[PDB]
Amino acid sequence: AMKGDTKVINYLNKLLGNELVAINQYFLHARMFKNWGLKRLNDVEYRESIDEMKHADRFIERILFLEGLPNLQDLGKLNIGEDVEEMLRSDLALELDGAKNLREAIGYADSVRDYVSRDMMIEILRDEEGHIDWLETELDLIQKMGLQNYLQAQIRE
Amino acid sequence: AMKGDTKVINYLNKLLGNELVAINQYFLHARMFKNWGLKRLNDVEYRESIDEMKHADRFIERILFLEGLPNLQDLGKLNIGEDVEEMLRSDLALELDGAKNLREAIGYADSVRDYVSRDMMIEILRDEEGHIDWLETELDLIQKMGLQNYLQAQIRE
Numbered sequence: 001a002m003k004g005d006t007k008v009i010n011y012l013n014k015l016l017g018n019e020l021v022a023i024n025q026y027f028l029h030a031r032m033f034k035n036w037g038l039k040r041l042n043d044v045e046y047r048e049s050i051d052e053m054k055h056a057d058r059f060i061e062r063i064l065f066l067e068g069l070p071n072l073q074d075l076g077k078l079n080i081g082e083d084v085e086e087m088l089r090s091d092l093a094l095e096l097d098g099a100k101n102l103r104e105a106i107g108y109a110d111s112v113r114d115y116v117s118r119d120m121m122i123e124i125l126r127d128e129e130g131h132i133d134w135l136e137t138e139l140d141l142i143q144k145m146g147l148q149n150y151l152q153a154q155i156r157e
Numbered sequence: 158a159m160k161g162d163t164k165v166i167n168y169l170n171k172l173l174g175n176e177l178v179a180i181n182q183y184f185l186h187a188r189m190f191k192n193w194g195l196k197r198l199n200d201v202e203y204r205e206s207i208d209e210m211k212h213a214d215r216f217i218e219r220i221l222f223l224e225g226l227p228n229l230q231d232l233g234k235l236n237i238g239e240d241v242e243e244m245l246r247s248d249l250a251l252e253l254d255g256a257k258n259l260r261e262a263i264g265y266a267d268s269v270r271d272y273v274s275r276d277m278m279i280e281i282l283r284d285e286e287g288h289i290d291w292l293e294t295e296l297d298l299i300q301k302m303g304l305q306n307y308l309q310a311q312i313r314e
């Protein structure tokens with residue numbers, strides 16, 4: 001029961017849209033992984049999709065508490081990718097942009113004393129840095145091994 | 158293990174994108190309803206969101222079976238709406254466009270003897286006509302009652 005900063009609400013709406021794009025992209029990648037028998041990749045995607053759903057729910061709850069309404073930007077075109085490397089590299093692109101947006105939002109909410117919105121986003125950003133670390137690590141392994149050797153290494157004994 | 162019609166795959170990708178837009182919009186509406194204490198509205202949304210997730214999964218599975226890959230169009234801007242009538246009227250707009258697209262796809266898959274894709278979409282279209290009926294009925298009740306009386310009538314004894 002309070003009216004929040006108008007720029008804070010706009011940030012929260014931008015960030016919510018980011019989470020929804022990521023969840024859509026996870027929906028497609030999971031099924032693609034599963035079809036190729038890539039169970040370890042599928043299980044990480046699935047698990048991170050749960051993280052993002054939790055973030056979106058937090059955003060919407062915060063917007064509603066601030067007497068704002070959910071109102072999304074153009075969510076654009078997804079770049080789903082055609083092979084595993086491209087899929088993970090697209091995910092990394094989304095994640096790095098989302099983290100950039102989160103930092104910007106955090107700086108601004110902090111600057112205007114919206115410390116509840118700030119603290120929620122800080123928690124979310126910690127989750128996203130974990131997502132980034134995972135992607136970077138996998139992509140570095142694909143570069144080291146070559147994609148086909150990497151994929152062959154996912155096959156279960 | 159077969160290669161499907163290229164236009165059939167493009168239809169399936171278009172229709173999949175439709176389902177993802179609808180699921181995003183359900184995610185936002187559910188939480189908005191829940192916040193306003195509109196439990197009956199929230200429960201229908203939630204339940205239909207489950208239908209749409211099932212449809213998207215069918216589409217992706219069919220695309221993968223046809224040796225296609227998931228590849229989405231611009232999913233655009235959602236019109237979330239600012240009051241209950243606007244929210245339901247936006248849902249009706251999505252649903253009517255999605256049903257139009259499904260009929261078009263059904264006619265074409267039938268015309269090229271892709272009767273498995275045709276039959277899957279027919280099943281999906283039956284679900285969507287149910288969604289439409291529900292929306293139209295609620296919207297007719299809002300017109301009859303006025304929105305405020307309608308909303309007051311949702312309140313639980």
Ligand SMILES: [Zn+2]
Nearest residue numbers: 025026029091
């Ligand atoms: Zn992914």
Ligand SMILES: [Zn+2]
Nearest residue numbers: 019051052055
């Ligand atoms: Zn997230």
Ligand SMILES: [Zn+2]
Nearest residue numbers: 052095128131
């Ligand atoms: Zn993430």
Ligand SMILES: [Zn+2]
Nearest residue numbers: 085142143147
């Ligand atoms: Zn490379």
Ligand SMILES: [Zn+2]
Nearest residue numbers: 182183186248
């Ligand atoms: Zn809705």
Ligand SMILES: [Zn+2]
Nearest residue numbers: 176208209212
């Ligand atoms: Zn559907």
Ligand SMILES: [Zn+2]
Nearest residue numbers: 209252285288
């Ligand atoms: Zn529907």
Ligand SMILES: [Zn+2]
Nearest residue numbers: 242299300304
């Ligand atoms: Zn009206």
